[PDB]
Design a protein around this nucleic acid. Structure first.
Length: 97
RNA sequence: AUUAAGACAUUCGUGAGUGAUUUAUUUCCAUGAAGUGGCGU
């Protein structure tokens, strides 16, 4: 009913985890891009959602579509209807699928 | 779907320009074209 897994990630090559991308904003990029030693938990959650959408073959491919609202419902109940945001940081549930 | 995706440390570039294997050095030093007469007593 509620199965728990342990997921181990083995780096097969050199990895790069993004930073602030800038000490300011506007249009500037950073000439030196530094790698965080750890990814954000948002990255882990998005990886889980993407892999779940890969197992159940419901992926967003090539320009743009509307994804067959029944498929929209199944994707909502699989991965949730929304990404990780800190607006719902006090919500009692993860809000995902 | 995850501070994400795309991005050759690459383009142009003669190991080239000036440079006498030249300067100094006697094929020279020593050396007899010389030696001897013979026989007919």
């Amino acid at each position: 009913m509620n199965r728990h897994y342990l997921i181990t990630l083995t780096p097969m090559d050199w990895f790069f985890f993004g930073g602030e991308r800038t000490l300011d904003d506007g249009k500037s990029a950073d000439y030196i891009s530094h790698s965080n030693k750890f990814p954000q938990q948002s990255a882990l959650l998005g990886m889980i959602r993407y892999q779940l959408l890969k197992q159940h073959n419901l992926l967003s491919q090539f320009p743009y579509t509307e994804n067959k609202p029944t498929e929209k419902e199944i994707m909502k109940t699989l991965i949730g209807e929304q990404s990780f945001r800190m607006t719902e940081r006090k919500a009692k549930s993860l809000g995902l699928g």
